[PDB]
């Protein structure tokens, strides 16, 4: 039995233009554990993204945090792209500062 | 500190 990931994209601190921050993509509730996660800036894959160590919840489903340092601006768009066996195609979730 | 004594093979 497979479980589809829940995906949240958000910043570590409330977003202030020109202030350094961290961009997070939290994936949780999925099974099996194999999953692909990229952070995007203006549609392009961000390099040197880091992630937490694979863990799981009381219901045995996995969760992972992907993150990178970034300085948000008025102009730049960001997103998280996730692929998993439960998805018919990659799912892109846009960063909505709210 | 992890649980290391013995061999817990299913």
């Amino acid at each position: 039995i497979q479980r589809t990931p829940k995906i949240q994209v958000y910043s570590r601190h409330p977003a202030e233009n020109g202030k350094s921050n961290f961009l997070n993509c939290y994936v949780s509730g999925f099974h099996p554990s194999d999953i692909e996660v990229d952070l995007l800036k203006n549609g392009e894959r961000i390099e040197k993204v880091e992630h937490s160590d694979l863990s799981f919840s009381k219901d045995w489903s996995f969760y992972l945090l992907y993150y990178t340092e970034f300085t948000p601006t008025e102009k730049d768009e960001y997103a998280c792209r996730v692929n998993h066996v439960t998805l018919s195609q990659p799912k892109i979730v846009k960063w909505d500062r709210d | 500190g992890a649980d290391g004594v013995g061999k817990s093979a299913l």
């Binding site: 160590d53 489903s61 993150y67 709210d98 | 500190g1 649980d3 093979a9 299913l10």
Partner: protein
């Protein structure tokens, strides 16, 4: 109350090498150790400052434990595939969670040691720490094997003694990290959906530990069946975030209140747009 918990994951990959084994350990909501069998030089690695100061003997012994566990989980995965008559082409997952809960008196409240196969309960040590609950016929094979081996006695010795001693040591050495509470910083945001409706989103940011309650009320009555609630998420700096939202008639925003409960607050918060 406090807890120490270990989470093991082993995943087979037929045709692509031996199974990968991952272990992480937590005190309460704070990770302190990781191991990955696929790392270039696999070693137990610190993830919290209050274990980085342990000496080389501690880290060598932990590393050796994980290496043995990775090797044991390879045989467990082979055994399991056989019990279930599964094809050798498929990838399968074995998970283990074990650890100890301390009560308010600092004494062992409950020990646990349970297993899942392909994400489904397989076998668990009962609360008495002497007998097993098997979830299906295949797990009864493991139960009989562990009864014969007196496996529960070994796990009980860890859960009642070793596990508690480690937890108390970590709570003391990491007290500035582990024995604090950071209260949530809270605020309401307002997002028009149309001229006629708006969503009110109640935020809790920067709090530790992760347990928290957020609720929307309307003229005093709670709005459970109409509240959108996201799962509590890590900020990435050791603290957590959560929000709860309702969609409200334009001009009635003032009738709603958000209520936050967290052990770090000096009193429950009420927020009104």
């Amino acid at each position: 109350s406090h807890s120490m918990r270990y989470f093991y994951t082993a995943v087979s990959r037929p045709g692509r090498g031996e199974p990968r084994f991952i272990a992480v350990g937590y005190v309460d909501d704070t990770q302190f150790v990781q191991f990955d069998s696929d790392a270039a030089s696999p070693r137990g690695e610190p993830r919290a400052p209050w274990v980085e100061q342990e000496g080389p003997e501690y880290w060598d012994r932990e590393t050796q434990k994980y290496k043995r566990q990775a090797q044991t989980d390879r045989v467990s995965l082979r055994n399991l595939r056989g019990y279930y008559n599964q094809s050798e082409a498929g990838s399968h997952t074995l998970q283990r969670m074990y650890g100890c809960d301390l009560g308010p008196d600092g004494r062992l409240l409950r020990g646990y040691n349970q297993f899942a196969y392909d994400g489904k309960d397989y076998i668990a040590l009962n609360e008495d720490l002497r007998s097993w609950t098997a979830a299906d016929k295949a797990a009864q094979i493991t139960q009989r094997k562990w009864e014969a081996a007196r496996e529960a006695e070994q796990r009980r010795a860890y859960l009642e003694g070793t596990c508690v001693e480690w937890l108390r040591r970590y709570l003391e050495n990491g007290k500035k990290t582990l024995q604090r509470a950071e209260h949530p910083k809270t605020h309401v945001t307002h997002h028009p959906v149309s001229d006629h409706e708006a969503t009110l989103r109640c935020w809790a940011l920067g709090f530790y530990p992760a347990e928290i309650t957020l609720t929307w009320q309307r003229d005093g009555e709670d709005q459970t069946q109409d509240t959108e609630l996201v799962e509590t998420r890590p900020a990435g700096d050791g603290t957590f975030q959560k929000w709860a939202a309702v969609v409200v008639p334009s001009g009635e925003e003032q009738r709603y209140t958000c209520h936050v409960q967290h052990e770090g607050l000096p009193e429950p918060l009420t927020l009104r747009w």
